[PDB]
C-alpha cells in the first residue's frame, strides 16, 4: 500500500501513467543541461530510499550524462591477428550505469558513491542519477544506518566495485553455477571472470 | 632574531676598503637584504651606515660591503673585532 509504491510502479512503465509527458518535458531541459548537474533534492525519491537515501547535511544527488553504445576501440600501432583487428562491435566490461558513478566521483572527489539509478534515456544519451554522501562529516557518522561509508576503508569503493552496478557488472550475483571461475574475485583466477 | 653576521674577513683587500674607502667587510647571511644589513650594523657597533653593497660569492657565502658615514670610521670598529 501507500504513496511510494504508486510512484515507483508508475515509473516502471515510463510510457504509461502520465510519466511519458513528463519524461518528454524534462528531457528537452536535460539535453540542454550540462553533462554533470548537482541537484539539492531527489527525483524518484521512491527509488532513492530503497538504495539508501537521507536528506541530512552532506547528501547530494547528481545527474551524470553518459553516452549510448559501447566502446570504440583505439587505432593500431602495430599489426594484429584478424580476431583482434575488430573495433565496431566492442562493448565494455563496465556497465554504463557504473560509468556514471565513477564520473560523479571524479567531479566531486571528497564525496563517495553510495549507489545510483537510471533517470531515463534518449537516442544519444543515458542519464543516471548518482547518490553520493560525504564520508568525512560528523553528521553521517553519528547515525548508524549510514555510518558504514564514513570509515576510512570505504573510500575508492566505486572503482573497485561494491555498489549495485559495480557488483552486477562484476558478475557476483550468484554463489553457484556460473560462479565457478569468478570466485571470490575475478583476479583471484587472474582475470578469468567477467 | 636570526644570525646576521657570520664573521669578519680580514685580508690585504680589507685594509684597502678600511683605509681609503672607509668601508667594512663582513660575511653575512646568504638570504640577506640591504635594508636589514644597514639597520643591524647601526644598532650593533653603534654607528651610522651611509650605504650597503652586497655580492653572493661562488664560495656559497654572501659578502657585504658596508659604508660608514666618515664620522664613524672603519678603523675604530675594525680594531675591536678580528684584531685583539
Amino acid at each position: 500500500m501507500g504513496m511510494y509504491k504508486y510512484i515507483r510502479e508508475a515509473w516502471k512503465s515510463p510510457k504509461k501513467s502520465y510519466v511519458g509527458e513528463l519524461l518528454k518535458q524534462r528531457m528537452i531541459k536535460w539535453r540542454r543541461e550540462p553533462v554533470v548537474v548537482r541537484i539539492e533534492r531527489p527525483t524518484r525519491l521512491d527509488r532513492a530510499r530503497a538504495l539508501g537515501y537521507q536528506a541530512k547535511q552532506g547528501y547530494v544527488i547528481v545527474r551524470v550524462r553518459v553516452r549510448k553504445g559501447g566502446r570504440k576501440r583505439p587505432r593500431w600501432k602495430g599489426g594484429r591477428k584478424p580476431s583482434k583487428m575488430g573495433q565496431v562491435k566492442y562493448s565494455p566490461k563496465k556497465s554504463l550505469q557504473w560509468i556514471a558513478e565513477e564520473k560523479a566521483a571524479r567531479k566531486f572527489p571528497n564525496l563517495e558513491v553510495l549507489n545510483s539509478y537510471w533517470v531515463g534515456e534518449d537516442g544519444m544519451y543515458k542519464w543516471f542519477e548518482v547518490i553520493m554522501v560525504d564520508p568525512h562529516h560528523p553528521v553521517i557518522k553519528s547515525d548508524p544506518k549510514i555510518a558504514w561509508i564514513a570509515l576510512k576503508h570505504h573510500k575508492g569503493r566505486v572503482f573497485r566495485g561494491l555498489t549495485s552496478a559495480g557488483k552486477k557488472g562484476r558478475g557476483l550475483r550468484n554463489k553457484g553455477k556460473g560462479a565457478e571461475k569468478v570466485r571470490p574475485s575475478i583476479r583471484a583466477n587472474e582475470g578469468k571472470g567477467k | 632574531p636570526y644570525k646576521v653576521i657570520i664573521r669578519p674577513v680580514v685580508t690585504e683587500k680589507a685594509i684597502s676598503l678600511i683605509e681609503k674607502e672607509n668601508k667594512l667587510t663582513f660575511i653575512v647571511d646568504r638570504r640577506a637584504t640591504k635594508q636589514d644589513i644597514k639597520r643591524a650594523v647601526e644598532e650593533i657597533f653603534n654607528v651610522k651606515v651611509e650605504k650597503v653593497n652586497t655580492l653572493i660569492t661562488p664560495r656559497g657565502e654572501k659578502k657585504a660591503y658596508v659604508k660608514l658615514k666618515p664620522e664613524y670610521s672603519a678603523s675604530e670598529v675594525a680594531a675591536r673585532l678580528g684584531l685583539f
Binding site: 500500500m1 501507500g2 504513496m3 510512484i7 508508475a10 510519466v19 518535458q25 525519491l45 521512491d46 | -
Partner: protein, 123 residues
Amino acid sequence: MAKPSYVKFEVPKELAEKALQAVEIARDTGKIRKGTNETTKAVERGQAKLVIIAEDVDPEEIVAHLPPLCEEKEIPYIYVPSKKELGAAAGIEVAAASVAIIEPGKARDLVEEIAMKVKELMK
C-alpha cells in the same frame, strides 16, 4: 498559471487564500495530514475530505498521481502555487507538497464551498 502536467486548471488567487485560511482552522479544530504520502493514504483510506496540492514541486513524480487517484475516490482537490505557504498553513516550519484535511471542524461550510467552487471551476 504555472506548473503543468497534472495541473489541469488555474485556481484563482482569491480561492487559494480561502483554501489556505480553511487549512489553518482545520489544524486547530479538526485534523489534518501533512506530507505527500499521508495525503496518499488519506485518499486510499477514504478519510480525506479535501486535498491541497503545491504547484512548484520538483520532480513532478512525488505529486503526479494525486488528481486521478482522487477522482476515483470522490475526493475533491484544489491547487496552491507555493509549497512553503502550504506547509505553513498546515502549521509547520518547512514546506509541504501535499496535505489532506482529514475531517474539518468549523471549516466545514468553507471546505464544502471550496469543493463546489472547484467543481464549478472544472469537474
